[PDB]
Amino acid sequence: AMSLENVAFNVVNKGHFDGQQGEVPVSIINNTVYTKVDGVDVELFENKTTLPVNVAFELWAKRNIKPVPEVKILNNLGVDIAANTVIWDYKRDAPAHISTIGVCSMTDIAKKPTETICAPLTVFFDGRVDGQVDLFRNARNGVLITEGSVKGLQPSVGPKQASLNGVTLIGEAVKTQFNYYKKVDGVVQQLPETYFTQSRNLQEFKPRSQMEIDFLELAMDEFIERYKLEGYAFEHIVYGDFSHSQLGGLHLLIGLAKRFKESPFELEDFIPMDSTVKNYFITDAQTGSSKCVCSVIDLLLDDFVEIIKSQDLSVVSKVVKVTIDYTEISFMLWCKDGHVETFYPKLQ
Amino acid sequence: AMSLENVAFNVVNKGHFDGQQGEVPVSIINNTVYTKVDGVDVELFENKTTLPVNVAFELWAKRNIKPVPEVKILNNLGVDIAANTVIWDYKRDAPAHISTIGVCSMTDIAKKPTETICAPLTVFFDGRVDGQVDLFRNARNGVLITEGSVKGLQPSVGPKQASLNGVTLIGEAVKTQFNYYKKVDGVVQQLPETYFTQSRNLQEFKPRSQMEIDFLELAMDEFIERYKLEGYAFEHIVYGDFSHSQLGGLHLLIGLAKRFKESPFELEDFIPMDSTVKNYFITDAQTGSSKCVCSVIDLLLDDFVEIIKSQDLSVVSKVVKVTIDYTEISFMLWCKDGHVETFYPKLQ
Amino acid sequence: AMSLENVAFNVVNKGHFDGQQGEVPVSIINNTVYTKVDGVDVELFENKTTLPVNVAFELWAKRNIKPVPEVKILNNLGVDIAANTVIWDYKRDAPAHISTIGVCSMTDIAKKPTETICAPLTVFFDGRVDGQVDLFRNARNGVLITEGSVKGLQPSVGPKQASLNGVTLIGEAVKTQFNYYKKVDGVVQQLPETYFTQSRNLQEFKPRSQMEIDFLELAMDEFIERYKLEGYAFEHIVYGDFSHSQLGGLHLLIGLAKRFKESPFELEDFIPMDSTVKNYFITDAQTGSSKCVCSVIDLLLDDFVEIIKSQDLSVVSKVVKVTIDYTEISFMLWCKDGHVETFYPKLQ
Amino acid sequence: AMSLENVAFNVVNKGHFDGQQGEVPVSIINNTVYTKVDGVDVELFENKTTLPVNVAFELWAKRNIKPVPEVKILNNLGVDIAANTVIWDYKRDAPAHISTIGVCSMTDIAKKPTETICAPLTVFFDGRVDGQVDLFRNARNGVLITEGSVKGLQPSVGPKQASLNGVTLIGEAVKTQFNYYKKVDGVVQQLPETYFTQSRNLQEFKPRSQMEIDFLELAMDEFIERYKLEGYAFEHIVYGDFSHSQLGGLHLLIGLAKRFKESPFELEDFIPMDSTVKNYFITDAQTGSSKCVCSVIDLLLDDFVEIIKSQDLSVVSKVVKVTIDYTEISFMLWCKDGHVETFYPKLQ
Amino acid sequence: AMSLENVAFNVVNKGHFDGQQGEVPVSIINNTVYTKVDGVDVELFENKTTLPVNVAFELWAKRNIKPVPEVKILNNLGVDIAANTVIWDYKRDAPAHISTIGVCSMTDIAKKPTETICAPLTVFFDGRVDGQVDLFRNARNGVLITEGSVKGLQPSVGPKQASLNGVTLIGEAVKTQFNYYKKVDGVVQQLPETYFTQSRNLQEFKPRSQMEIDFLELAMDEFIERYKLEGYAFEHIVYGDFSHSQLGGLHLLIGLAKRFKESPFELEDFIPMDSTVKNYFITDAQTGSSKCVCSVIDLLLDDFVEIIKSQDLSVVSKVVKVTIDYTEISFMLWCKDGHVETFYPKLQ
Ligand SMILES: COCC(=O)Nc1ccccc1
Ligand SMILES: COCC(=O)Nc1ccccc1
Incomplete structure (x- = not known):
C-alpha cells in the first residue's frame, strides 16, 4: 500500500x-x-x-x-538494473539505474527478477538478502555480490572499499569486500585479474603504503632515487609539469594530492559521475598552468609503479591496456631512447 | 488513510x-x-x-x-470556509476558500466545524447533508442552505439557479433554489430584500420573461415604445452606443446578447472571477468602438426596468445603492432635465 | 514611480x-x-x-x-522599436519589438526617441500623439502613421484595416486607414505601390467585392465563366484540388473559406506570427488530402485576378515578385502551352 | 507605498x-x-x-x-506569529511563521496585533520596540522578550545566546539574554525551570566548562574516573560505540565533536529545521558503523551529568521527562543491576 | 554548423x-x-x-x-561586448556581457566587430588573437588588451593578476599583466594613473608586502607605531571597532583577514558581482557587532597608507576621489583636530 x-x-x-x-x-x-x-x-x-x-x-x-559496490564497479561490470533495491548514485544525486524490480510502481519493469523482461538485462543481486544467490543462478544475465563462498561458483575478490550511504569506506564494523560473480546469456563469466582504484578524495587523501608515505614525505629527486624510478617520467606523469601554459602530466591522484598541500588548484569535474578514470579541467592557481582534459586515476602508487615498470620501452607510441575495476583501461605510452616520455589514461 | x-x-x-x-x-x-x-x-x-x-x-x-450556491453568492454573504466539503471555483479553477474543515490534511484548520478556530469564521453549512442544520445551530458565524423549511428559522429564498460541476443551471431533475440563513456572532440575521443576477452566458443567452422575449425580438424604437421606456436612456445603457471611439453604455447582459447575434465583439475579462458585477475591456469588431472598463450586470430586464423606474431623476449625479445577490451594488445615476443620461454599476 | x-x-x-x-x-x-x-x-x-x-x-x-498598424505591416516596413508605446503582438502574445523607448525601466534603451541609440533604429511614430510628427522630422530612421495630411510630406495610403486590442477591423467609430511615411538615413522615402492583404479570418470571412460575393455564391464552373478566368488554374490555385494525397493549390483565403462552409479542415499554424503570407499544415477532413506547407495569402479576389492576369504565360517556371504590404512577395508561376498550371506564394 | x-x-x-x-x-x-x-x-x-x-x-x-530568540525557543513556547516583524528561519531559508502582522500585504492577517484575528494566536512581542510590552499586556495569547524588568510580570531568564542574522552568538556588543514571558487565554503563564541547549556547531565546537574542557582533552577512561561517571554508560551514550553495524549511543553533541577530530562522519540532517533534539542519519567514515535515526542534543556536559545522576537506576525501562528550551523532552532510560545501559532523547 | x-x-x-x-x-x-x-x-x-x-x-x-581581465576592470573601462569570445563572469555564473559578436546565433548582434551595430558599443579586443589590434584601430569604441607594445599607441600597464577559468592569479606559466588601450568616438583615450585592487580572498589571504606581513604579524599598537600611523584612525578604519552594536570601520580586506584568524564572521554579499568596492552585511560572530552596508576594498596596505597620508586633514567632512581599477572611487574623509576620525569608500 x-x-x-x-x-x-x-x-x-x-x-x-x-x-x-x-x-x-x-x-x-x-x-x-x-x-x-x-x-x-x-x-x-x-x-x-x-x-x-x-x-x-x-x-x-x-x-x-547497506555497504554496496561503488557505481563505477557496477557500470564496469555491465549492471543494468538492481534486484528489489535502489542503488543510489551519490555522485549524481540520482538512482544508478533507470528502472527498478519490485521497488516503485512508476519505475518497475517487473516485481521479481524472474520475469522474462529481466532475462536480457544484467540484474544486480545481493547475496546478503535471502534467496538472491538462487535468483542469480536462475537469471540469464547478472552480477552477484556475496560476503562468503557460493558452492561451485568461482569467486572474484572485489575491492576492499564499498559505498555506505555515499561514504566510500573500508569496513571495520561492516563487511565491504565482496566476492563478485557475473553471468552473460546464462553462462557464468570468469572475471579478469584486475587492479582496483582506491576511491580517495583530493581533500582527505591518506597514503595506503610505504611507497605512498614516501611520495608525500620525500622530495621528487629523493623519491625517484629511493624507488629507482629514473627514466620513468614520474616528474611529468605523477608530479606534474607546471612550467608551461599546458599543465604537463598529472594523471595520478597521489600526485595531485602532494601538489594540493603546497598550493590550491581548480579541478572542474565537467562530467560529474563515478568513473574509474576521471576527466578534469585543471587550472593551477599558483602558476596558471592548465589542461582542458586531464585524465586522473587513483591507483595505489605501488600498483602504478608495477604497471609502468612492466612495459616495453622500445616503441615511440603504443596503446597499453590495463584491467582496472573489471574494465579495460587503455593508456597511451610514449617512449624515446628506452625511457618513458609520457604514460596517461587514453582519451577518445 | x-x-x-x-x-x-x-x-x-x-x-x-x-x-x-x-x-x-x-x-x-x-x-x-x-x-x-x-x-x-x-x-x-x-x-x-x-x-x-x-x-x-x-x-x-x-x-x-451537488448543485451548490454560485461563488458570488457565497462571497456576497461573507462565507470564509465550507463545512466538510470543497466549493470549487470553476471561474478561477481553484478552491473558492483558502482553508478546509475535514477535507485535506494540508489545508485543514479543523476536522469538525465545532472547533474553536471555526467560531469566528463564517462557515458554509449544507442542510442536505446529515446534521449540518444542527451544526449551523451550534455555530457562532455561518451561512446555511436548505432545500425545505427549517422549523423556527425564517428563510430567505435564494436564486433559482445553482452551480452543478461548473454548469450554472435552474434545476429540473435536481433542486437548485435554496433557502438561505445567516448567523453573525450567534444571532440569526434577517437577510435583505435582494434581486438576483441571472448568471447567463453571452453565447447561450435565453430570455426569461415576455419583456426579455420582446427585447431580443423587437427593434430599439418599438421596444422602448411598447414598454414606455422613453427618457430612460435604454438606447445608451442597455442597447449601447457604438458611434464614437468610446463604446457608450452597454451595461446589461441582455443588450450585449442582442448585439452578439448581429456583430461579434471582444470581451476581455481582466479580473477572472465570479462577481455580481463583471468588468470587461470590450472592443466592438464592427465599428471599433471600445471601453477599457465596461461594467456588466445580468439582471432580468423586468428587474432592471423596475430599478431604473424607481429612481428620482432630478439630480445631475447620484449614487444609487441596490441590493443584488445579498450585496449592496452602487450604481451611478446621471440625469439632465428629468431624464436619464446614464445609469451604470459604479466602477472602483 | x-x-x-x-x-x-x-x-x-x-x-x-x-x-x-x-x-x-x-x-x-x-x-x-x-x-x-x-x-x-x-x-x-x-x-x-x-x-x-x-x-x-x-x-x-x-x-x-488605440487602432494600430498590424505587426506584419510594421515588420514589412522595417520597424525596430516604437516611440513611447508598446505594440502588442496578439498573434504571438508578446511585445512586437524587443526594446522600448520610455515605457519600462527593464526594456528601455532610451526615455526619448531623440537619444543617439535610437538614431540607427527604425522608430515607429504615431502622428495622433502630440509632437510625434515633429519627432519623426528630427529622427534619422523611422516610420510615421498619421490620420490626415502632413504638410510637405507625400503620403502612402495604408490599409483600410488596423488592429484594435487584437481585433483587426475596418473602423467606423475610429480611424483605421493611416497615411504612412518612412525615413532612411534622414531621407524621406517614396513608399512603393503595394497591394494590401485583407486580414480576414477563415471562420468569419466576409466578401469585400462583387467578385468575392460571386465566388462564394456561384459554382466553380459558373464563376470561372462569368469572370473569364479560363486557363488561369483557378480550379487548382483558388478552389483547391482534393482528389490526391497531396492537397493541390489552395493558396487564397477566400477559396479556403468557400471550402470551410461545406467541409471542415485542420490548419496547423506551425509558425504562429503575423505574416503577409501564412504557412499552414493543412489536412482536409472530408477527403484526407493534405499539404505540409500550404502558403496562404488573403488578397482581395479582384487584386489576385489582376496579379495573375498581368503575367507573361510563356515560361515553364518563373519567379513573379509582387509588392504586398510594402514587402516584396515572390510567387512561383508555372505555365504550360500558354496557360497557368500553378501560381503560389514561394515557400522558403 | x-x-x-x-x-x-x-x-x-x-x-x-x-x-x-x-x-x-x-x-x-x-x-x-x-x-x-x-x-x-x-x-x-x-x-x-x-x-x-x-x-x-x-x-x-x-x-x-536584531538578535532574536532562536526558532526552536519560539516553537517550544508555542509562537504562531510575530508582531510587526519577520523572524527569519535561516536553518530553513524561510520565514519562521506563515502569516505576518503589519509587514507584507500578501501575508498579513492584520496590520496591528490588537485585531480580533490575533487574539487566539500566540503573538511574539519584542519589548525593545516601543509599545510592544503594552501590546503583550493587551493580547490574549503571546510571548514577550525584554531586555530588563517589566513591573509586576515575573521573568523567566532565557538562554545566553540569540540569533543575529543567522549567526547564533552570546552577545558582547549586544544583549542576547532576554527575560521571557508567556500568555495563554489572557492569563500570564509561569514558564518552567528549564535547561538550555548550547546551539553549538559540530565544526566549530568550543567547550564552555572545565568538564567540557576535560572531556575533549582527557581519554575516555581518565575522564570517566575524574568525574566519577562509572556505571553511567558514558562510553555508549556520550562517547559512542563504533564496534557494531549499528552505531551505539552518541546522543550528546560534545561526544560527536570529540570523535570528529579523530575521524570524519556523515550526519544526514533529514529534517532540516531548528530543533532542541536533532535527528541525524549518521554514518561513521572510519568504521562503517551507522544509525538511521540518531537523536542528538547539545546540553552542557555538566548539565547532562546532572540530569543522568539525578535518576533512579532501579528500573529496566523508564521514560525520563526533562524540561529543555521550555519544552518537555522525554528521554528513554534503560538500566540493569543499578547501572545505566542507555539514556537517549526518546524517538516516536 | x-x-x-x-x-x-x-x-x-x-x-x-x-x-x-x-x-x-x-x-x-x-x-x-x-x-x-x-x-x-x-x-x-x-x-x-x-x-x-x-x-x-x-x-x-x-x-x-585564456587569462582575461577581471569583470570589474572590464566594467570600469566601459566594456559592453567582447569581439568573437565570451567573457564568463564566474562571480555571477553568467556571461559578463548581454550580446555576443560571432559566438552564438541567439545572442549575436553581428558576426564581425566591423558591423555598424558595434560602432557605438565599447567592444573588447584581445591582442593575442590575430587581427584584433587592427580591429581595435578600426573600431569607433573599444578596449584593447595586449601582451606587448602596439606601435604608436601609448600603453597603460594593467594589473598583475588576471582571471584564468575563474581563478584569479598572477601568472607564472602565462602572461596575466596586459597593456590596456581605450577608444571613445574614434579617439584613443588616455587611461588614468590608477591603483589596482589585489583581488584576494578572505579565506586564502596572503600578504604581498613587508607592511602587509607586519600588519598580520604585529599587534595593533606596535604596527601603528612602526609605520608611524598615529592619528590616522587605523584602529577604526583597518582594524575595526567591535565594541558597539554597529561594527566600526573595517573597510580594508587585510583588516578583515587579520580578524578572521582570531574569530569568524558572516559576510553577507547581498550584491554578488565583481566590484572594485564590495558591499557586505557583516555580522561579527564573537561580539555581535554588525553593519548592514560595510564597504570593503582590497588595496595593498602600502597603497592605502599612501592614499590616506596624502590627504589634507583640516576639514570636518570631505569627499576624496581616488582612481582605482581605472574607475574613480569616492571616499568619505572625516577629520577632527588635524587627525582622521574615519575614511571609507563612500556609499550612495
Ligand atoms: C443561537 O442561534 C440560533 C439558531 O441557530 N437557531 C436555529 C438553528 C437551526 C435550526 C433551528 C433554529
Ligand atoms: C530631414 O528629414 C525630412 C523630414 O523629416 N521632413 C518632414 C517631417 C515631418 C513633417 C514635415 C516634413
Whole structure:
C-alpha cells in the first residue's frame, strides 16, 4: 500500500523508507518535497534527477543503506538494473539505474527478477538478502555480490572499499569486500585479474603504503632515487609539469594530492559521475598552468609503479591496456631512447 | 488513510474522490498530475491554483458535485470556509476558500466545524447533508442552505439557479433554489430584500420573461415604445452606443446578447472571477468602438426596468445603492432635465 | 514611480496601465501574475513571452489600446522599436519589438526617441500623439502613421484595416486607414505601390467585392465563366484540388473559406506570427488530402485576378515578385502551352 | 507605498528593507529575483520557501536584523506569529511563521496585533520596540522578550545566546539574554525551570566548562574516573560505540565533536529545521558503523551529568521527562543491576 | 554548423567548446542540461543566468579559457561586448556581457566587430588573437588588451593578476599583466594613473608586502607605531571597532583577514558581482557587532597608507576621489583636530 505520504512518513520517522505504516502531510512545489512540521513547511528532498519529483523521492527513500559496490564497479561490470533495491548514485544525486524490480510502481519493469523482461538485462543481486544467490543462478544475465563462498561458483575478490550511504569506506564494523560473480546469456563469466582504484578524495587523501608515505614525505629527486624510478617520467606523469601554459602530466591522484598541500588548484569535474578514470579541467592557481582534459586515476602508487615498470620501452607510441575495476583501461605510452616520455589514461 | 495515489485512483475510477480504496501510479511534473495507463502517462489534472499541485489535486478531487450556491453568492454573504466539503471555483479553477474543515490534511484548520478556530469564521453549512442544520445551530458565524423549511428559522429564498460541476443551471431533475440563513456572532440575521443576477452566458443567452422575449425580438424604437421606456436612456445603457471611439453604455447582459447575434465583439475579462458585477475591456469588431472598463450586470430586464423606474431623476449625479445577490451594488445615476443620461454599476 | 503592484492596480481598476496611483497585493508563481481579491488569488496575466514574467506583465499592461498598424505591416516596413508605446503582438502574445523607448525601466534603451541609440533604429511614430510628427522630422530612421495630411510630406495610403486590442477591423467609430511615411538615413522615402492583404479570418470571412460575393455564391464552373478566368488554374490555385494525397493549390483565403462552409479542415499554424503570407499544415477532413506547407495569402479576389492576369504565360517556371504590404512577395508561376498550371506564394 | 522595486532598492542600497524611498529595475525568473546593475542581471534572492518568490523576497528583506530568540525557543513556547516583524528561519531559508502582522500585504492577517484575528494566536512581542510590552499586556495569547524588568510580570531568564542574522552568538556588543514571558487565554503563564541547549556547531565546537574542557582533552577512561561517571554508560551514550553495524549511543553533541577530530562522519540532517533534539542519519567514515535515526542534543556536559545522576537506576525501562528550551523532552532510560545501559532523547 | 548536441559533444570530450565535430544525446529539463552516458543522464550544466538554458550552455561552453581581465576592470573601462569570445563572469555564473559578436546565433548582434551595430558599443579586443589590434584601430569604441607594445599607441600597464577559468592569479606559466588601450568616438583615450585592487580572498589571504606581513604579524599598537600611523584612525578604519552594536570601520580586506584568524564572521554579499568596492552585511560572530552596508576594498596596505597620508586633514567632512581599477572611487574623509576620525569608500 505505497503512497507519497507513507514514503514521507518513513523519511521523517525512520530516516529512510523502512516499510512502517503512517502518513504525514506533503506538498510538492516544483522539484522539492516538503512536509508540514508544526504549521510550517520543511524541505525533505530536492530532486536533482531527470525523473518526476515524487518518483525520485520514493527511489531515494528506498535506497540501499547497506555497504554496496561503488557505481563505477557496477557500470564496469555491465549492471543494468538492481534486484528489489535502489542503488543510489551519490555522485549524481540520482538512482544508478533507470528502472527498478519490485521497488516503485512508476519505475518497475517487473516485481521479481524472474520475469522474462529481466532475462536480457544484467540484474544486480545481493547475496546478503535471502534467496538472491538462487535468483542469480536462475537469471540469464547478472552480477552477484556475496560476503562468503557460493558452492561451485568461482569467486572474484572485489575491492576492499564499498559505498555506505555515499561514504566510500573500508569496513571495520561492516563487511565491504565482496566476492563478485557475473553471468552473460546464462553462462557464468570468469572475471579478469584486475587492479582496483582506491576511491580517495583530493581533500582527505591518506597514503595506503610505504611507497605512498614516501611520495608525500620525500622530495621528487629523493623519491625517484629511493624507488629507482629514473627514466620513468614520474616528474611529468605523477608530479606534474607546471612550467608551461599546458599543465604537463598529472594523471595520478597521489600526485595531485602532494601538489594540493603546497598550493590550491581548480579541478572542474565537467562530467560529474563515478568513473574509474576521471576527466578534469585543471587550472593551477599558483602558476596558471592548465589542461582542458586531464585524465586522473587513483591507483595505489605501488600498483602504478608495477604497471609502468612492466612495459616495453622500445616503441615511440603504443596503446597499453590495463584491467582496472573489471574494465579495460587503455593508456597511451610514449617512449624515446628506452625511457618513458609520457604514460596517461587514453582519451577518445 | 489519504494519499496522492489513492486520490488519483478515485479520480481514474469514480470521476472524483468517492472514498474508495486503491492506488494508481502517479507522477508529478511541474504543475501537472499524470498517471501510468498501460505504459504511457495520461494527464489527470493541471494546477491552475496558487497551492502545491498535489494539494490542489486533492481539493479538486474532493470538490462538491451537488448543485451548490454560485461563488458570488457565497462571497456576497461573507462565507470564509465550507463545512466538510470543497466549493470549487470553476471561474478561477481553484478552491473558492483558502482553508478546509475535514477535507485535506494540508489545508485543514479543523476536522469538525465545532472547533474553536471555526467560531469566528463564517462557515458554509449544507442542510442536505446529515446534521449540518444542527451544526449551523451550534455555530457562532455561518451561512446555511436548505432545500425545505427549517422549523423556527425564517428563510430567505435564494436564486433559482445553482452551480452543478461548473454548469450554472435552474434545476429540473435536481433542486437548485435554496433557502438561505445567516448567523453573525450567534444571532440569526434577517437577510435583505435582494434581486438576483441571472448568471447567463453571452453565447447561450435565453430570455426569461415576455419583456426579455420582446427585447431580443423587437427593434430599439418599438421596444422602448411598447414598454414606455422613453427618457430612460435604454438606447445608451442597455442597447449601447457604438458611434464614437468610446463604446457608450452597454451595461446589461441582455443588450450585449442582442448585439452578439448581429456583430461579434471582444470581451476581455481582466479580473477572472465570479462577481455580481463583471468588468470587461470590450472592443466592438464592427465599428471599433471600445471601453477599457465596461461594467456588466445580468439582471432580468423586468428587474432592471423596475430599478431604473424607481429612481428620482432630478439630480445631475447620484449614487444609487441596490441590493443584488445579498450585496449592496452602487450604481451611478446621471440625469439632465428629468431624464436619464446614464445609469451604470459604479466602477472602483 | 513605476512598480509591480502599481501596474497590477492599474490592470485591476482601469483595464490596462492608465498611470493611476495605487497598489494591489501581487504574487508571482512561475509565469503567472496573481492578485489577492477578497482573500483568494485571481490570475491577472499568463506570461507567454521569452521575457521575465513581471517585465512582460508591465509591457502587456502598457500596450497601445488605440487602432494600430498590424505587426506584419510594421515588420514589412522595417520597424525596430516604437516611440513611447508598446505594440502588442496578439498573434504571438508578446511585445512586437524587443526594446522600448520610455515605457519600462527593464526594456528601455532610451526615455526619448531623440537619444543617439535610437538614431540607427527604425522608430515607429504615431502622428495622433502630440509632437510625434515633429519627432519623426528630427529622427534619422523611422516610420510615421498619421490620420490626415502632413504638410510637405507625400503620403502612402495604408490599409483600410488596423488592429484594435487584437481585433483587426475596418473602423467606423475610429480611424483605421493611416497615411504612412518612412525615413532612411534622414531621407524621406517614396513608399512603393503595394497591394494590401485583407486580414480576414477563415471562420468569419466576409466578401469585400462583387467578385468575392460571386465566388462564394456561384459554382466553380459558373464563376470561372462569368469572370473569364479560363486557363488561369483557378480550379487548382483558388478552389483547391482534393482528389490526391497531396492537397493541390489552395493558396487564397477566400477559396479556403468557400471550402470551410461545406467541409471542415485542420490548419496547423506551425509558425504562429503575423505574416503577409501564412504557412499552414493543412489536412482536409472530408477527403484526407493534405499539404505540409500550404502558403496562404488573403488578397482581395479582384487584386489576385489582376496579379495573375498581368503575367507573361510563356515560361515553364518563373519567379513573379509582387509588392504586398510594402514587402516584396515572390510567387512561383508555372505555365504550360500558354496557360497557368500553378501560381503560389514561394515557400522558403 | 510598498512595491517589489522599492523592496529591491532597499536590499541593493541598505542591505535589507530600511523603509527608504526609491526603485531599481527588477526581473523575476522562476524563483530568483534579479536586478539590472550596469546592463547585466545580478541575483538578489533565491526563493527556497513555499511562498511566491516576490512575497518571500519582501519577507526576507523585512527580516528582523536584531538578535532574536532562536526558532526552536519560539516553537517550544508555542509562537504562531510575530508582531510587526519577520523572524527569519535561516536553518530553513524561510520565514519562521506563515502569516505576518503589519509587514507584507500578501501575508498579513492584520496590520496591528490588537485585531480580533490575533487574539487566539500566540503573538511574539519584542519589548525593545516601543509599545510592544503594552501590546503583550493587551493580547490574549503571546510571548514577550525584554531586555530588563517589566513591573509586576515575573521573568523567566532565557538562554545566553540569540540569533543575529543567522549567526547564533552570546552577545558582547549586544544583549542576547532576554527575560521571557508567556500568555495563554489572557492569563500570564509561569514558564518552567528549564535547561538550555548550547546551539553549538559540530565544526566549530568550543567547550564552555572545565568538564567540557576535560572531556575533549582527557581519554575516555581518565575522564570517566575524574568525574566519577562509572556505571553511567558514558562510553555508549556520550562517547559512542563504533564496534557494531549499528552505531551505539552518541546522543550528546560534545561526544560527536570529540570523535570528529579523530575521524570524519556523515550526519544526514533529514529534517532540516531548528530543533532542541536533532535527528541525524549518521554514518561513521572510519568504521562503517551507522544509525538511521540518531537523536542528538547539545546540553552542557555538566548539565547532562546532572540530569543522568539525578535518576533512579532501579528500573529496566523508564521514560525520563526533562524540561529543555521550555519544552518537555522525554528521554528513554534503560538500566540493569543499578547501572545505566542507555539514556537517549526518546524517538516516536 | 552549430548545434546543442555539438556544443554538448565538445563539453563532454574537450572540456569546453573546441570546434570539434560530433554530437552526444542531450536532454533539457527545466534549467539543467543533461547528457546520456551509458543509459543514465549526467548533468553537464546548471543555468544560473537570465538567458534560455541552451543559450547559456553554448555561451558557457564558448567561454574564454585564456587569462582575461577581471569583470570589474572590464566594467570600469566601459566594456559592453567582447569581439568573437565570451567573457564568463564566474562571480555571477553568467556571461559578463548581454550580446555576443560571432559566438552564438541567439545572442549575436553581428558576426564581425566591423558591423555598424558595434560602432557605438565599447567592444573588447584581445591582442593575442590575430587581427584584433587592427580591429581595435578600426573600431569607433573599444578596449584593447595586449601582451606587448602596439606601435604608436601609448600603453597603460594593467594589473598583475588576471582571471584564468575563474581563478584569479598572477601568472607564472602565462602572461596575466596586459597593456590596456581605450577608444571613445574614434579617439584613443588616455587611461588614468590608477591603483589596482589585489583581488584576494578572505579565506586564502596572503600578504604581498613587508607592511602587509607586519600588519598580520604585529599587534595593533606596535604596527601603528612602526609605520608611524598615529592619528590616522587605523584602529577604526583597518582594524575595526567591535565594541558597539554597529561594527566600526573595517573597510580594508587585510583588516578583515587579520580578524578572521582570531574569530569568524558572516559576510553577507547581498550584491554578488565583481566590484572594485564590495558591499557586505557583516555580522561579527564573537561580539555581535554588525553593519548592514560595510564597504570593503582590497588595496595593498602600502597603497592605502599612501592614499590616506596624502590627504589634507583640516576639514570636518570631505569627499576624496581616488582612481582605482581605472574607475574613480569616492571616499568619505572625516577629520577632527588635524587627525582622521574615519575614511571609507563612500556609499550612495
Ligand atoms: C443561537 O442561534 C440560533 C439558531 O441557530 N437557531 C436555529 C438553528 C437551526 C435550526 C433551528 C433554529
Ligand atoms: C530631414 O528629414 C525630412 C523630414 O523629416 N521632413 C518632414 C517631417 C515631418 C513633417 C514635415 C516634413
